[PDB]
Design a protein around this ligand. Structure first.
Ligand code: CLA
Ligand code: CLA
Ligand code: CLA
Ligand code: CLA
Ligand code: CLA
Ligand code: CLA
Ligand code: CLA
Ligand SMILES: CCCCCCCCCCCCCCCCCC(=O)OC[C@H](CO[C@@H]1O[C@H](CO)[C@H](O)[C@H](O)[C@H]1O)OC(=O)CCCCCCCCCCCCCCCCC
Ligand code: KC1
Ligand SMILES: CC1=C(C#C/C(C)=C/C=C/C(C)=C/C=C/C=C(C)/C=C/C=C(C)/C=C/[C@@]23O[C@]2(C)C[C@@H](O)CC3(C)C)C(C)(C)C[C@H](O)C1
Ligand SMILES: CC1=C(/C=C/C(C)=C/C=C/C(C)=C/C=C/C=C(C)/C=C/C=C(C)/C=C/C2=C(C)CCCC2(C)C)C(C)(C)CCC1
Lengths: 132, 85, 74, 215, 89, 617, 185
């Protein structure tokens, strides 16, 4: 039928589009698509069409409620702030070392919880935005 | 000339270091494959192999239901894409 | 019927590798044969590194621009 | 054109995106900014009845689409949110600067000077707890009213619309809220000028010829 | 005896004190040479292994160890990838 | 057989370790085996040093008087020496801190050194055994947990050999005891401990146990961060290699800085030459590792990356902005540093040194005074004096250091500009839109399109390596002159004459070469003769690199063709050589550029090493 | 047998970093003092004057060379008097440039502003000429009246440039210029 060059380009576009939409599904079976390489882990899609993180991004605590994570992050923040303040400025612990006595383990254990509070509040907002 | 496949796209093939020797079909296929990889919202998880000699892990996810819903998603996506063009 | 950009009309090049990519050029002539893959002959004020300023482009690699919808300052 | 993937910033066909917060859906902002500015509260008689914005700071969000197609510069809605927040904070700061010099409330160290009270309350064992409580309360009332999306002009809330209205305002048929908003904005700008004057007097004595003896 | 060269050698007056005896005798040098000969034999073995590459039957005819089976199945220790990365995690 | 050309040598030898192209041992197990073999080579090299130190060396005499004795590296038995030179030379002296390291880590005898050599040889044998059997099982070995465990074990070693370990009461048997009991082996005094003028062994052991524990925790945190958000989307040997090389370069440069300013080896600062050589060597290694990180990033772009909307895709899309802004930074820095240096040169030349532009490094002085210094030296930012200061070797900066740091910034930014430009244009430029199909390294694209010389991505590294060497030369000149002034107590000759570059010539290079050149002359030869000879040899290598860089192939190919004609027309040899076997052809363009760069940098390194030895001897 | 001069660190275990506000000024820094009473700077000036006088003594009184060296001496004296207000260390005597941002003698803010205005003038004049002469002919062949019009009209560059930046007439949309997309982005 005297195929046009534009018709050949149309077929190339159709082939590319069909391939692209076909290789996504479980009919190509390439090492890239193996769990922990490119895919989203089987039953745990991290985000949908809109780039909004799902509760699956939290891992083990993917079903801890938003209120509980808020309480966890606030308690961790308060305890970590108390430990940091009691280690650095109020009753300093390095100056206690200069006195020949050991550290106070309570202060260190408390101050260890600040990054816990950070990631906990990030996870708390993730849960709240997902309705959990 | 610049419609040749990229070397990264032709990796692990005989045309890895010589993408200019690949077929038109192969170049188009890999150029569509790279686009397919970048759509993890619809990319398939491709379940793990069963290599251990023990019994199959019970897990908590049904691969059959996921495969069926992925077939449905692939069908609808292809329909929409062909409607677009 | 005529297919492709009108003669003498400014077009923007959509070919990623072209020296005048996303730049603007004047259409000299469009080959009205369906078998020609790159009929749209476009002339540019700038010459490329080969000191040639005329090249043929495919129909899908050129965007026809209206008389005042582009930027005269390139 | 270019495929659906590989679209970032300056690539043709790349719709602008705004998703700073991990956990929130992607938002695609239109230019707006100037369009919102043309119908924006402010611009009273003091500057000729027109929206006094030299240097074109409200147009930079529109110019984001020309620079790199990225939300580098704030939307005018974010500018109004910042102006409102600055105005309220500066009203409170001015009243605090002229109230701490005469009044004292808690177990905080006695420091009438405003420029030293913050540090001396940091150092106080029974002041650090109070400042921590103030900080967490402010953080709560600030993250609850996060706005943030006003950076791209889609805040879904008029600027300075925290969940706070104990009186009958914003609900009475009378008491036009436009005049109240204009009064709030202009008094906020006035308080910001006052705080700048306080800082200048603290650093360059005799600058403002009314706070010469002030701290 | 040495002719000192350099301003700091003369200024600091550091002397190169030769030990009275040698330090390793001759027997321990021989033991070091023997151990180096064993290392050389191992190096020859490694060179022969690497030059001819890995044969295709091994890693294909020799079944993977249960550790290797489970690691490849679960994608650990650089598996589920195409990199070496000794400083993985 | 062998009916190839001499080009085959330099073509395969340039990719002889490009194992990804070697289909035989292409698996990652083979690459781990290569790592094992390399570590065996490193162990044997350390065994070499320890064996020659313990065999013909004065370590037993070094531990007694570390300040008054010069460490001996190995015995010299060159047959070319003249009896006098034989009587003159005692043994090859030491230019590395291995005596100091052995003294620090508890070596007190040559028997311990011999046992160390045997252990190093046995460990090299173990590494060879591990390389004999590549296997996914061996791929489990390694990780940040493993290196942190190595750090913990090194902490245990240092605790066992700390000077205060004798006073230490056994913690695991009699309990932790008083705090001082632990302070016998674990301290955080901070800074130089006086006496040995180095960090206490207790400090180093405590550092290592803390680092190991923190590394274990960080590795666990990173792996749980891999639990959720598990995405190995881009795996490539070159991506991970670039990561490792950049981190290693940062760590090595930091090692140079913090080992000069916080020496950890006892009685090291008293040895000026070893300190200077340490700093220069580690800075060169760190710069090389960073350059390798950039190179392997470029390679990953060339042949392992697939375009996406990811971090790298965003970098590539706006590569014009990156290159343009880096070019602006380099132009500004070079213009201003060169102009200020030339202005100072003119002012000093015209007898008006006061009219020089000396911009005080007030920002670095502010940082130093506020954060580091314990006494008011400059008085800006803070003037408090520390009641209980700690000691270190942080230099006190002045006006010239501002210009020198701007030169350093210019060098670093220009190197980054070249490397980033080449890596991002590996995806293509408008002169070469299809560079993604030509590989990392190639000669050119011919004389067409105006010319395409050095357009390859490998040529970007080739051009940027000159800048790497130049930047390292700049800041190593800075360090060497600073420490020479400090040791010679001048500290004012530097602070005044480093403002203008004629100072950098006269007072640094011309001044510090006086003793090196007298290594051998008509009067005789002294211990510096070897270093003057190496100085000349390095200059010769540098100029041969000039030959390979300036003159290009075609000339040399025609000349070699004429030489082949002479051979084939020569008597008694045309019957034997028909030029069919290993045909002599001129070096390919890429091979020539690499060999010229190699001679250039070999002469660079050897020249500066000889100069450092002759100046700080 | 000794090492490099050991510096003393601040064992800052207090948990706070104190920055003295009163030390944020050149006059409060203990390592730089005004050139007027800097003994090293005065010695430098004396040595310069002595060298100039020695150079002058070579030429006889009243000669042209004598007058030239005398004018050089007067220039040096005036330069020294002017530089007495500068800041020059405490051990070097060479006047320093203060790039903190304080408006002081020998500062950087005023020279920075002057240079930036001048070179924005240059760049805006060139850009205006290129915009009003979109032609290679007028680039190789300078339109001197139009070129000088642009050069003298670029005096308002700081405000016109910002107006164009905010109004979109200064920068170009990335989709309308030759940008590198050969990787088929
Ligand atoms: C940082 C605080 C801040 C912010 C974000 C805004 C934001 C806004 N103002 Mg506003 N304003 C402020 C403080 C502020 N104002 C103060 C203190 C005054 C008193 C002089 C005013 C007086 C004022 C008037 C009279 C008008 C506005 C208008 C506007 C809107 C458009 C202008 C614009 O885009 O500027 C946003 C960007 C900035 C403000 C950048 C500020 C950064 C500069 C460089 C700081 C320089 C000041 C410096 C400290 C010197 C001090 C000077 C001294 C007088 C204190 C926008 C919502 C117009 C309006 O309502 O439009 C409808 C209008 O007509 N403002
Ligand atoms: C590492 C940066 C970071 C990130 C990604 C987040 C992310 C988040 N925060 Mg958050 N936050 C941060 C730092 C950060 N925060 C800091 C430093 C504080 C102060 C201690 C807070 C205090 C805070 C509160 C009090 C709340 C959040 C909340 C939230 C969540 C939603 C609302 C929001 O983002 O508004 C907050 C946005 C910000 C605080 C902007 C921070 C921008 C950072 C500080 C960069 C600033 C750099 C400068 C230019 C010695 C040269 C979201 C997950 C809310 C929540 O849990 O869900 C409802 C909430 O109520 N944040
Ligand atoms: C652990 C680090 C590491 C590792 C594993 C690799 C691995 C690799 N690199 Mg690499 N590289 C590194 C660091 C590393 N590199 C660093 C730090 C740099 C910057 C300097 C580079 C720069 C670099 C470039 C520029 C290239 C590679 C390439 C390669 C690949 C092929 C190597 C090959 O066959 O070269 C062959 C090796 C040689 C020819 C060695 C040269 C021998 C030296 C010069 C002898 C001279 C010393 C002499 C004794 C001195 C005498 C002194 C005189 C006075 C007598 C391979 C995957 C190539 C590649 O992938 O291309 C596709 C490539 O082109 N690398
Ligand atoms: C990072 C860990 C580490 C490292 C690198 C070293 C390194 C060293 N130790 Mg050591 N040590 C460590 C941890 C470590 N130690 C710990 C934790 C302790 C406490 C239990 C000790 C206790 C200790 C003592 C008591 C002595 C050493 C000695 C030595 C030196 C010679 C040992 C040798 O090769 O001959 C011994 C080893 C062999 C002959 C063969 C090697 C052993 C196997 C075959 C190889 C190991 C393969 C490897 C793990 C992979 C050497 C510098 C000796 C010395 O003189 O140092 C001053 C010495 O007397 N160490
Ligand atoms: C590979 C790890 C490792 C190993 C095998 C050892 C081995 C040993 N440590 Mg040790 N240690 C280590 C790491 C290690 N350390 C680290 C990382 C630290 C830092 C916290 C210490 C701190 C330490 C102290 C403080 C003491 C020991 C002691 C000892 C000895 C126990 C008594 C004995 O000799 O029994 C057979 C033994 C040699 C005790 C001893 O007497 O050593 C001299 C002792 O008091 N260790
Ligand atoms: C002394 C030798 C020398 C010098 C001066 C330069 C200079 C430069 N190289 Mg370079 N290069 C050299 C050797 C040298 N190279 C060698 C041997 C190699 C190995 C092949 C390279 C490889 C190389 C690469 C691969 C790259 C450069 C780049 C650059 C530029 C960096 C920007 C900069 O610093 O601008 C400052 C410019 C100068 C200092 C030149 C001198 C200008 C004047 C004379 C000094 C200032 C005087 C005064 C202020 C002006 C008066 C103004 C008015 C009164 C008239 C610059 C032009 C990079 C580039 O072009 O990026 C922009 C780049 O990518 N070079
Ligand atoms: C209209 C003239 C003009 C203008 C507006 C600019 C503007 C710019 N140039 Mg540029 N440039 C020019 C001429 C001009 N250039 C010329 C003639 C050359 C060849 C030497 C260059 C070479 C050049 C390089 C190599 C680089 C820039 C860069 C830049 C940008 C940063 C500013 C900078 O570093 O300037 C510095 C300018 C120079 C180093 C060269 C200046 C040479 C003269 C002084 C300029 C000519 C003025 C013109 C003739 C005036 C005539 C007016 C008359 C006809 C009426 C900026 C967009 C940098 C960039 O991309 O950063 C983002 C960058 O790396 N330019
Ligand atoms: C002191 C040490 C400092 C001196 C060493 C500095 C060397 C710079 C480091 C760069 C090394 C990597 C460069 C590289 O491998 O590619 C440099 C090039 C890369 O290889 C080139 O690759 C091209 C396609 O990629 C073509 O195939 C060229 O033919 C091929 O040469 O290698 C060569 O040119 C090797 C030629 C010289 C080989 C001589 C062996 C010397 C052994 C003596 C010991
Ligand atoms: C009924 C329970 C209750 C009592 C009885 C109580 C009493 C005191 N509060 Mg308190 N308080 C809440 C509950 C109670 N507070 C709640 C729900 C909030 C969040 C809205 C809140 C906020 C703050 C803040 C922000 C500060 C604060 C402090 C003090 C203080 C002074 C102590 C002193 O000066 O010694 C005393 C006696 C201030 C302080 O000075 O702390 C150092 C300080 O800054 N409070
Ligand atoms: C919102 C709300 C409520 C509320 C509320 C609250 C808390 C309202 C608070 C309002 C508040 C606190 C408003 C302070 C303004 C302070 C200003 C303007 C300071 C100016 C400072 C100035 C003008 C300084 C000026 C000078 O330096 C200048 C410029 C030059 C000199 O020559 C002269 C001097 C030195 C003087 C209700 C009623 C509780 C319930 C309802 O339902 C909802
Ligand atoms: C080519 C390319 C590549 C590569 C890249 C690279 C190679 C990179 C590197 C990078 C790097 C290599 C980085 C680094 C970084 C670092 C850092 C970031 C640091 C920082 C620090 C700081 C900042 C601090 C500082 C300080 C001090 C310490 C002292 C003084 C003061 C101060 C504070 C300043 C890839 C392929 C991948 C992609 C594409 C492109």
């Amino acid at each position: 039928y005297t195929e046009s060059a534009q018709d050949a380009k149309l077929f190339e576009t159709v082939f590319s589009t069909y391939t692209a939409e076909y290789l996504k599904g479980p009919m190509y079976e390439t090492p890239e698509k193996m769990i922990g390489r490119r895919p989203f882990n089987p039953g745990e899609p991290l985000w949908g069409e809109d780039k909004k993180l799902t509760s699956n991004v939290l891992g083990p605590l993917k079903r801890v409620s938003s209120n509980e994570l808020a309480f966890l992050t606030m308690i961790c923040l308060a305890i970590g702030a108390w430990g940091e303040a009691q280690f650095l400025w109020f009753d300093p612990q390095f100056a206690a070392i200069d006195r020949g006595e050991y550290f106070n383990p309570i202060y260190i254990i408390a101050a260890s919880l600040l990054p816990v509070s950070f990631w906990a509040h990030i996870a708390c907002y993730i849960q709240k935005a997902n309705g959990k | 000339v610049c419609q040749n496949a990229k070397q990264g796209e032709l990796k692990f093939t005989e045309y890895w270091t010589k993408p200019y020797e690949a077929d038109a079909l192969t170049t188009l296929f890999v150029k569509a494959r790279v686009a397919a990889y970048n759509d993890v919202v619809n990319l398939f998880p491709l379940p793990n192999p069963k290599l251990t000699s023990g019994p199959a892990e019970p897990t908590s996810v049904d691969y059959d239901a996921l495969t069926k819903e992925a077939m449905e998603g692939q069908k609808k996506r292809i329909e929409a894409a062909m409607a677009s063009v | 019927a005529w297919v492709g950009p009108k003669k003498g009309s400014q077009v923007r090049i959509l070919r990623p590798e072209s020296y005048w990519f996303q730049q603007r050029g004047t259409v000299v002539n469009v080959n009205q044969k369906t078998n020609i893959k790159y009929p749209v002959t476009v002339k540019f004020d700038f010459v490329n590194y080969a000191n040639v300023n005329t090249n043929g482009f495919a129909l899908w690699e050129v965007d026809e621009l209206k008389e005042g919808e582009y930027d005269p300052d390139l | 054109a270019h495929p659906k993937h590989m679209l970032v910033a300056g690539v043709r066909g790349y719709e602008m995106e705004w998703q700073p917060i991990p956990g929130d859906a992607v938002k695609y902002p239109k230019p707006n900014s100037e369009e919102m500015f043309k119908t924006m509260i402010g611009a009273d008689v003091e500057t000729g009845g027109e929206a006094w914005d030299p240097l074109g700071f409200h147009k930079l969000f529109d110019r984001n689409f020309d620079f790199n197609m990225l939300p580098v510069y704030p939307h005018v809605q974010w500018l109004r949110e910042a102006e409102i927040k600055h105005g309220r904070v500066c009203m409170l700061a001015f009243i605090g600067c002229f109230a701490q010099a005469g009044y004292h409330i808690g177990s905080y160290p006695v420091q009438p000077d405003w420029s030293k009270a913050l540090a001396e309350c940091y150092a106080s064992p029974t002041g650090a707890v109070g400042l921590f409580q103030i900080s967490v309360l402010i953080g709560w009332i600030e993250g609850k009213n996060y706005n943030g999306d006003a950076w791209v002009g889609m805040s879904e809330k008029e600027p300075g619309d925290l969940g706070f209205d104990p009186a009958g305002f914003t609900k009475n048929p009378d008491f036009d809220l436009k005049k109240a908003q204009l009064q709030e904005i202009k008094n906020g700008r006035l308080a910001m000028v006052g705080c700048a004057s306080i800082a200048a007097n603290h650093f360059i004595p005799g600058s403002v010829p009314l706070l010469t003896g002030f701290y | 005896e040495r002719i000192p060269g350099g301003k700091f050698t003369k200024a600091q007056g550091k002397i190169v004190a030769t030990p009275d005896e040698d330090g390793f005798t001759d027997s321990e040098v021989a033991l070091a040479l023997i151990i180096a000969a064993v290392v050389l034999y191992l190096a020859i073995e490694v060179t022969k292994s690497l030059f001819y590459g890995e044969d295709p039957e091994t890693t294909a005819k020799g079944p993977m160890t249960p550790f290797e089976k489970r690691v490849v199945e679960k994608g650990l220790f650089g598996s589920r990838g195409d990199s070496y990365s000794p400083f993985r995690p | 057989y062998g009916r190839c050309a001499t080009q085959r040598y330099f073509q395969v030898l340039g990719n002889i370790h490009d194992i990804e192209l070697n289909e035989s041992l292409n698996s990652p197990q083979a690459i781990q085996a290569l790592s094992f073999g390399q570590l065996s080579v490193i162990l044997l090299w350390l065994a070499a040093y320890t064996f020659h130190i313990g065999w013909s060396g004065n370590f037993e005499a070094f531990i007694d008087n570390p300040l008054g004795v010069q460490p001996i590296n190995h015995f010299v038995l060159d047959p070319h020496y003249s009896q006098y030179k034989v009587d003159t030379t005692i043994a090859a002296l030491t230019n590395h801190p291995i005596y100091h390291w052995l003294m620090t880590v508890g070596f007190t005898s040559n028997a311990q050194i011999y046992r160390f050599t045997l252990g190093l040889e046995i460990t090299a044998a173990v590494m060879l055994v591990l390389s004999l059997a590549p296997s996914v099982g061996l791929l489990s070995m390694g990780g940040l947990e493993v290196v942190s465990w190595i750090s913990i074990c090194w902490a245990g070693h240092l605790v066992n050999f700390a000077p205060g370990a004798a006073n230490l009461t056994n913690v695991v048997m009699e309990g932790p005891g008083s705090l001082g009991n632990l302070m016998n082996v674990l301290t955080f005094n901070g800074g130089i401990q006086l006496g040995t003028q180095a960090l206490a062994v207790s400090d180093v052991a405590h550092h290592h146990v803390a680092i190991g524990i923190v590394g274990l925790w960080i590795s666990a945190l990173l792996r749980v961060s891999k639990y959720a958000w598990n995405f190995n989307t881009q795996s490539s040997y070159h991506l991970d290699l670039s990561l490792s090389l950049t981190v290693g370069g940062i760590l090595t440069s930091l090692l140079a800085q913090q080992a000069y300013v916080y020496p950890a080896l006892s009685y090291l600062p008293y040895d000026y030459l070893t300190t200077t050589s340490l700093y220069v060597h580690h800075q060169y290694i760190g710069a090389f590792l960073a350059t390798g990180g950039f190179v392997h990033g470029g390679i990953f772009l060339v042949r392992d990356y697939t375009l996406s909307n990811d971090l790298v895709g965003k970098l590539l899309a706006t590569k014009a902005t990156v290159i343009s802004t880096l070019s602006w930074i380099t132009l500004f820095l070079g213009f201003h540093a060169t102009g200020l240096y030339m202005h100072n040169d003119a002012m000093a030349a015209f007898g008006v040194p006061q009219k020089q532009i000396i911009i005080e490094p007030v920002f670095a002085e502010f940082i130093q005074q506020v954060f580091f210094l314990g006494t008011p030296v400059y008085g800006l930012g803070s003037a408090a004096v520390s009641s209980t200061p700690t000691l270190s070797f942080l230099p006190i900066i002045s006006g010239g250091d501002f210009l020198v740091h701007h030169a350093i910034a210019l060098g670093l930014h220009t190197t980054v500009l070249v490397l980033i430009k080449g890596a991002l244009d590996s995806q293509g430029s408008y002169l070469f839109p299809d560079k993604q199909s030509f590989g990392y390294g190639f000669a050119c694209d011919g004389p067409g399109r105006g010319g395409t010389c050095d357009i390859s991505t490998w040529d970007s590294f080739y051009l940027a390596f000159f800048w790497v060497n130049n930047t390292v030369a700049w800041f190593t000149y800075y360090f060497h002159w600073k420490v020479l002034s400090l040791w010679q107590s001048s500290t004012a000759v530097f602070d005044e004459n480093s403002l203008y570059l004629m100072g950098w010539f006269r007072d640094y290079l011309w001044q510090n070469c006086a003793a090196l050149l007298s290594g051998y002359d008509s009067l005789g030869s002294n211990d510096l003769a070897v270093w003057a000879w190496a100085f000349l040899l390095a200059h010769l290598a540098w100029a041969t690199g000039f030959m390979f860089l300036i003159s290009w192939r075609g000339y040399w190919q025609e000349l070699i063709d004429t030489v082949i004609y002479m051979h084939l027309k020569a008597p008694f040899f045309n019957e034997i050589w028909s030029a069919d076997v290993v045909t002599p052809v001129a070096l390919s363009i890429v091979q020539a550029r690499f060999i010229g760069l190699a001679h250039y940098v070999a002469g660079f390194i050897l020249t500066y090493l000889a100069f450092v030895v002759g100046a700080t001897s | 047998i000794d090492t490099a001069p050991v510096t003393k660190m601040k064992n800052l275990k207090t948990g706070t970093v104190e920055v003295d506000q009163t030390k944020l000024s050149v006059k409060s820094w203990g390592h730089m003092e005004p050139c007027g009473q800097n003994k090293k700077f005065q010695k430098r000036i004396k040595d310069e004057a002595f060298k100039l006088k020695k150079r002058q003594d070579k030429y006889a009184k009243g000669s042209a060379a004598y007058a030239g060296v005398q004018e050089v001496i007067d220039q040096a004296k005036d330069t020294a008097k002017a530089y007495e207000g500068r800041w020059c260390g405490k051990k070097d005597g060479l006047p320093r440039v203060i790039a903190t941002g304080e408006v002081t003698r020998g500062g950087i803010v005023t020279p920075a502003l002057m240079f930036l205005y001048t070179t924005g003038w240059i760049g805006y004049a060139g850009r205006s000429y290129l915009l009003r002469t979109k032609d290679a002919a007028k680039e190789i062949k300078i339109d001197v009246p139009l070129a000088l019009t642009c050069m003298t009209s670029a005096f308002a560059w700081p405000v016109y440039s910002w107006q164009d930046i905010t109004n979109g007439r200064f920068v170009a949309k990335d989709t309308e210029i030759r940008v590198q997309r050969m990787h088929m982005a």
